[PDB]
Write a protein that binds this ligand. Structure first.
Ligand SMILES: N=C(N)c1ccc2ccccc2c1
Length: 246
């Protein structure tokens, strides 16, 4: 997350930290995630497409820091790693960038909801917030594009939704961004999501209810002028989410 503010997991209890076990024993951070049900975590396929081995991944809930065992956190293994069959990645654009992770503890149990571990409500069909609506993003991703390390403490920021017609402008992304994708950025281009925030939530408060409107997918650089953050429009993938979680 470029700019914004440092936060703890109590402000984002649906946020899931996904790590990977390397051959040798080393563990590194991969992507962010969102708990939609006690057994399921939703993320992006581009986070796992090159390493589709479910045994390699570790999922944390109620974790506030990258290398700290936060009080009340829960560690999980991936029982089932479901990737979207029609996933593809162009020069910039990532298509069907949605993945489901069935989480399981070593005792074979799903997430136990608490103060720091909660689910995020899925949006309703054809009911997304209008352009200009302020939405929040969370992640352990880069603070600056030039950084190679990720921040230790969890970060959050507020970005405004950009219409499809505005994001399809030549100086923006042109025809590369589709109706299945949602654009969101800072009008002053100072704050944005970045490398490492991928798979993370884009939560919008619509009609008094907090909902998982987007999933961090792609973007040209980080916090660049006329280059918004592109998010997987969750509302479109509702029949896919329902069928693969049944
Ligand atoms: N401009 C962004 N918000 C953005 C989002 C996701 C990314 C993933 C990998 C590298 C850069 C990214 C930038």
């Amino acid at each position: 997350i470029i700019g914004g503010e440092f936060t703890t997991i109590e402000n984002q209890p649906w946020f899931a930290a996904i790590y990977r076990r390397h051959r040798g024993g080393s563990v590194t951070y991969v992507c962010g995630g969102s708990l939609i049900s006690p057994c399921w975590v939703i993320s992006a396929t581009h986070c796992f497409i090159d390493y589709p081995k479910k045994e390699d991944y570790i999922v944390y809930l109620g974790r506030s820091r990258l290398n700290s065992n936060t009080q009340g956190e829960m560690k999980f293994e991936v029982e089932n790693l479901i990737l979207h069959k029609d996933y593809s990645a162009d020069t910039l654009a990532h298509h069907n960038d949605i993945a489901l992770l069935k989480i399981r503890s070593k005792e074979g149990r799903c997430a136990q909801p608490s103060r720091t571990i909660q689910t995020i409500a899925l949006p309703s069909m054809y009911n997304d917030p209008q352009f200009g609506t302020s939405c929040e993003i969370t992640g352990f991703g880069k603070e600056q594009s030039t950084d190679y390390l990720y921040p230790e403490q969890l970060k959050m920021t507020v970005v405004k939704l950009i219409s499809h017609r505005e994001c399809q402008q030549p100086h923006y992304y042109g025809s590369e961004v589709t109706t299945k994708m949602l654009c969101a950025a800072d009008p002053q281009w100072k704050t944005d999501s970045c490398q490492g925030d991928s798979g993370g939530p884009l939560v919008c408060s619509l009609q008094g209810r907090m909902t998982l409107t987007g999933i961090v997918s792609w973007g040209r650089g980080c916090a660049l002028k006329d280059k918004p953050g592109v998010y997987t429009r969750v509302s479109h993938f509702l029949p896919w989410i329902r069928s693969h979680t049944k």
